[PDB]
Design a protein around this ligand. Structure first.
Ligand SMILES: Nc1nc2c(ncn2[C@H]2C[C@H](O)[C@@H](COP(=O)(O)OP(=O)(O)[C@@H](Cl)P(=O)(O)O)O2)c(=O)[nH]1
Ligand SMILES: [Cl-]
Ligand SMILES: [Cl-]
Ligand SMILES: [Cl-]
Ligand SMILES: [Cl-]
Ligand SMILES: [Cl-]
Ligand SMILES: [Mg+2]
Ligand code: NA
Ligand code: NA
Ligand code: NA
Length: 326
DNA sequence: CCGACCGCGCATCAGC
DNA sequence: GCTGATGCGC
DNA sequence: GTCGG
């Protein structure tokens, strides 16, 4: 919150670019600047000071000067007053509606929650569930609830096959006191980079969690990735918990460290780390770290026995998950 | 000045 | 059906 | 929008 006004402004600008302008690189540029400014340990006194930080250039520096002088930004004030920009921005808040669908809906005269609810037949499955839990999905999850959810997921997974390992990642693993959703990394000895010896490894787990009425809805589901909706059980006479987003990712057991690095994030941290990898001549995904050849072709997976080995390859000092919240 | 900007799973669609 | 491109979200 | 080279 030290430079909260500035970071909020950059984030609003980032969202505009992504949702309305459909300019993903401007979106990332603003997110990068917000992130660097968020961790800067001084109250920013000028745009020039800000411009010293990597990711902050001339245009953002001017915006910071305007914001510091006036408490606001004219570019944003106008954006807020633009009905078409306002409408697209709102619609993209529904899970499943992105920039393209949002602008398409607006073209068709569909621009409010009421419009969505009366045109439910124009929504795909993902969009329908996003609309249904629109309110719920914007509520954060207290770590206490995350702990209860972890306990259910771990125990239920254990009931299916004691050889499964489920790990809660995302901001939870980075020690955050609240989370937007739950991310679960899943392994089982049967599924490795070499072989898949049992079918339905993910399916069985999803099934059990639906069976106990923990998972309530499915957004998408394939052999290795589940994205859906869950809900803690409530007690007698007590109000129901909000429905929550849950993602489950089944990763080859021998590829756990790359997978846990990936699912812990943050997403900006992963982008930064992967970009650094490239500068050092490596490429990182959720499975492997590979050297890049003298032309640019990914080579063979390098041996990895800890998250820190991955840091070591790219000559970064190790950062604990708590220090990855960029 | 100017490409390059992380990397990928699932749903959905166009074209054959 | 299939492949491949796009959207969306992670 | 920013940056490296
Ligand atoms: N490489 C990469 N990894 C990503 C990206 N987006 C997400 N991930 C990885 C890293 C993310 O950490 C992880 C989960 O994605 P959530 O969006 O749930 O992000 P968080 O859990 O961090 C928090 Cl926003 P919280 O949900 O508690 O509010 O997936 C991406 O664009 N690129
Ligand atoms: Cl762009
Ligand atoms: Cl403003
Ligand atoms: Cl690994
Ligand atoms: Cl790989
Ligand atoms: Cl930590
Ligand atoms: Mg999360
Ligand atoms: Na700078
Ligand atoms: Na959306
Ligand atoms: Na998630």
């Amino acid at each position: 919150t030290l430079n909260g006004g500035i970071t909020d402004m950059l984030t609003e600008l980032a969202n505009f670019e992504k949702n309305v302008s459909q300019a993903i690189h401007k979106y990332n540029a603003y997110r990068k600047a917000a992130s660097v400014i968020a961790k800067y340990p001084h109250k920013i006194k000028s745009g020039a000071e800000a411009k010293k930080l990597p990711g902050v250039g001339t245009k953002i520096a001017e915006k910071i000067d305007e914001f510091l002088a006036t408490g606001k930004l004219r570019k944003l004030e106008k954006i807020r007053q633009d009905d078409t920009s306002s409408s697209i921005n709102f619609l993209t808040r529904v899970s499943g509606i992105g920039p393209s669908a949002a602008r398409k809906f607006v073209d068709e005269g569909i621009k409010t929650l009421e419009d969505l609810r009366k045109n439910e037949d124009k929504l795909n499955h993902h969009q329908r569930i996003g609309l249904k839990y629109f309110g719920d999905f914007e509520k954060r999850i207290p770590r206490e609830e995350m702990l209860q959810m972890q306990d259910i997921v771990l125990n239920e997974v254990k009931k299916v096959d004691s050889e499964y390992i489920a790990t809660v990642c995302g901001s939870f693993r980075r020690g955050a006191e609240s989370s937007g959703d739950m991310d679960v990394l899943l392994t089982h000895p049967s599924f490795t980079s070499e072989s898949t010896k049992q079918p339905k490894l993910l399916h069985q787990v999803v099934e059990q969690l639906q069976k106990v009425h923990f998972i309530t809805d499915t957004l998408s589901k394939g052999e290795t990735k589940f994205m859906g909706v869950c809900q803690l059980p409530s007690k007698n006479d007590e109000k129901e918990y909000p429905h929550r987003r849950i993602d489950i990712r089944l990763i080859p057991k021998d590829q756990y460290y790359c997978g846990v690095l990936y699912f812990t994030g943050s997403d900006i941290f992963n982008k930064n780390m992967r970009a650094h990898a490239l500068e050092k001549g490596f490429t990182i995904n959720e499975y492997t770290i590979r050297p890049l050849g003298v032309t640019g072709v990914a080579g063979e997976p390098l041996p990895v026995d800890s998250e820190k080995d991955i840091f070591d390859y790219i000559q970064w000092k190790y950062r604990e998950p708590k220090d990855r919240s960029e």
